[PDB]
């Protein structure tokens, strides 16, 4: 049952490989019975799975992991409710082509520590939708929340008609046990989510890998924006699970025409503008040894200031530092994974996009940018911003945490919790990963 | 030796060199369509060629005119690749999308006919006679059957020649055990119209036994699953009304359950109140007449009329509150301000005031059928099911603290909705305080909330409402031992998702503690 | 080479080698099936993939 | 602009005759007054601007339907009785006739 | 004695409304099993892509 070293790891994959090859011959009708019943009991346990992931890691709000486990179980079910992935997809009689879908096989699942239980619901639902199996290798900080989250989906699928051991997981991870899983000869895909040191390792084993990277989110608030909307949406998305989500607003770029009104709208609300000694007192607590320290990742805004050496009020939510330089020397131009911002000032709209082009240079090359303007009266600025920014998704008037993931505020992005960045960031998707990436379409000509 | 043996040997020949590259098959592709599909299902390659030379047919645009022409033929993850196609210019693109903000589609869904006046019970019952209905089932309370209220329907129905049957065995709270009893009576009688005579729980028990008579294999554990958004939920309700219509005659003047898609039923195994919400539970006809409301006692008139104040007050500040349900939410508060003191004291000697309160409860039911309630009804369903406090008394104690809870300029964890611009629940609470005329012509926003809170503090004073849950008959040794369980149960009672704030569990137990000790909630 | 192309840390689009098993059942056109194998296998002396 | 002014002033007369009618009950008095509140604040804004103030073109398009809730159940008065004859005799468009 | 005429409040079964809810509401009439539809338009709305 348990897996701790490499001798019983190969007994786990050989159990999964035997039970996957009889799941690969299922029909379309008896997979939608399994895919519905797995999502039906994954949204039923959104409350206890959210309390385990804060008891294990201690880096999030328990009330925000409820609607993140709910997004990963009923929005992933709703978009891919009736999508052909098992039998004959299309057929042409005038040209004589039949397009048949397949599975891929065993998939190496690498979950992060920021979203330890929501990606375990998401990667399990899209795996048994396309009639293939998955092996999980959780982060060592939050290993018990991920293995419990994959167990609820597994035991609900077996009661619906799945094979006996379809979803396996490493019970006690290691830097050697996970590397022995990725170099296994009879796995076929690596679904790997994490930082830039992991994407280089996921594409280093000889296997097709679907990796995603990290990323900043430069925000451009020009002079014709809604100031009451742009401030209240940054505060909602950056405080969403204390900013542990990918594509959270790490830095805003405001033009000089409305730079003072945005600062006053931030100051009267839950933002706290750092001034003088407090600005330098927090820049040496974020970068520990040239990297982001794991002591502020996901902590509230009053514990970051307590770790810095002063005290903000207990109900403040965003630490704002007004910086000037766009470089690797400034620690506020990096990915923080914490409710901390960085306000830049620009003299024009076309200068604000220029500073935003240098802010997708340090952390995350093609992940996500954002822009706040009136999207009806200014159609020339929404096309100039889409042509200049080299990201994968361009959000307009949208909170980046709820808008980076799909099916919220747009109803046309594919809902997923693994956001691709393309070959800019060293990936091969440039999209949101769904069940259409694990198909291996086969044509009959 | 056979065709099905030839595919078996071909499956072992794609095993040694190249796992998913290319196979081929020669047969007549018109007379044998069953062999070209069995060969396509068995062979695990990327392209299946039929009657084609594999060198000219493996590359595209020869012999097929539909394969993409390329000289680099993929094999997929069988052979350790990531394409499973012919490589073209569409694999070297890195598509970039620009997503603009859109708003969630709202609605305004009501019953097909809402008949209402002073005595329009038999004039509305003549419509279901002329529709060809011949077998009717009437779900009543035990009090309404012993006092001739159920005989006002059976006398009109049986005089026209239909077969009636009365189920009068519901309680104050409609547990699941007395629902399957009525559903067993339903499919043994096979009616065509279900008349839900009653004010609250007789109507909620009739909506669920309408489900288990229409589709008798549905599970209650899937109806009570909390969604994040309707039209995107997991368990779709089946299409009802295929063999039984629903008529909704109301008697109490507090609950607009005749127009709302709600049915609050108790699980009866763990003791939990579950608000079941989907728009297939909307009745086909709502009959709101004030002849059944005149002989209502004073304890039921005060519990009901203050419940309908909280119905129109939470449906006006909610995030689903559009311009369609803001007029009905304010009209139901104008009538409940002028006539609810008159309908309690004067009672049945002032019929024109007892009629307007019975109409104002249904007008508030138009408001929260389309823009759901907030966090006050989420705690009132748990507070009422734990200590047996009647619904109407529970949310009356709670409403003075939820108003102080929601009216914040910068609240912690405001909710996520595309229509909701910013936290603006304090402005909409001030739009109530001058629509009712409670404010002087010169006031700030923070002063109008005080005059609104002072209005329904005196309204609960002259209606016989206690000041605290402790004065309502709740022991401190029992309340403080369950104040942590009820604070987590109220977090996921499906009315939480429409509040202007997204409440923390630590904040939901602060409202419950300050309401027991009679204090006012201060952040 | 596919094992080496996916071993450097970079997104790679690799293709492999492959056999081509041919099934000629009893209802085939024998004059077509033989004359098409001879055309495609002698095409550049069979150096083509598939 | 000619269709926006003819329509928006027609929906004012829809909610104004459905509020004073004899069939006007308490169910259609809130919708008759809500459709006049939105047509007071946004109909000058939706005419001058147009598509340069979409949030005002949307509220007028909703306020015409909210007035349609009012006079579906409490019918119009004598102004629409003369406007149907004045519009069919001299080819005056509906919306211009009952506005005069 | 005097009685009052029975009034009513009759509406369509579904009144869908927002900024762009034309194709999201048209997906409801697809899932209801409707297979043949007739569309009555004006002459201007047919020549302008409406
Ligand atoms: N692209 C997205 O949608 C997305 C979503 C969430 C997070 N992220 C990124 O991931 C980060 C979350 O924090 P994190 O701690 O998970 O980042 P991380 O890079 O530490 O990733 C942790 C996980 O990656 C694996 N891993 C790490 N180093 C490895 C190695 N050398 N070899 C093999 N596997 C290795 C581990 O198994 C672990 O579970 C964020 O910084 C963010 O940029 C991206
Ligand atoms: N449908 C909805 O959306 C909705 C909304 C709120 C509450 N509810 C549910 O309904 C219940 C509240 O119902 P309620 O209190 O309005 O009615 P009720 O069924 O609780 O009636 C209270 C008692 O008074 C008696 N009674 C009822 N009508 C009478 C009349 N005309 N004259 C004299 N006596 C009468 C009945 O015998 C009953 O036992 C709650 O428990 C709640 O769960 C439903
Ligand atoms: N389906 C297709 O797309 C397709 C088309 C033609 C050929 N092929 C395959 O190619 C073979 C034809 O012979 P070939 O000589 O081209 O194959 P090969 O594998 O010998 O390829 C040789 C070329 O690949 C590179 N290469 C080889 N080994 C390498 C390593 N370890 N690291 C880095 N680069 C390396 C070299 O630069 C060399 O030019 C056939 O067996 C066939 O399976 C496939
Ligand atoms: Zn209520
Ligand atoms: Zn008109």
Numbering used by the authors:
A (entry chain C): 1 to 445
B (entry chain D): 347 to 869
C (entry chain D): 198 to 247
D (entry chain E): 644 to 743
E (entry chain E): 446 to 495
The authors write:
AdhE is a bifunctional enzyme having two catalytic activities responsible for two consecutive reactions converting acetyl-CoA to ethanol. In addition, AdhE spirosomes undergo a structural transition from a compact to an extended form, in the presence of cofactors.
Here, we present the atomic resolution (3.43 Å) cryo-EM structure of AdhE in an extended spirosome form in the presence of cofactors. We found that AdhE stably exists as an extended spirosome form in the presence of Zn2+, NAD+, and ethanol. The cryo-EM structure reveals that AdhE forms a right-handed spirosome with 130 Å width, and four AdhE molecules make one helical turn with a pitch of 120 Å, which is consistent with the previous SAXS analysis on an extended AdhE spirosome. In the cryo-EM structure, there are clear densities of NAD+ in both the ALDH and ADH domains, and Zn2+ in the ADH domain. The AdhE dimer in an extended spirosome is widened by about 10° compared with the dimer in the compact spirosome. In contrast, in the extended conformation where NAD+ is bound, the NAD+ binding pocket is widely exposed. In the extended AdhE spirosome, both the ALDH and ADH catalytic sites are readily accessible to solvent from the outside as well as the inside of the spirosome. Furthermore, the interaction between the ALDH and ADH domains of two different AdhE molecules creates a channel between the two catalytic sites, which is located at the inside of the spirosome.
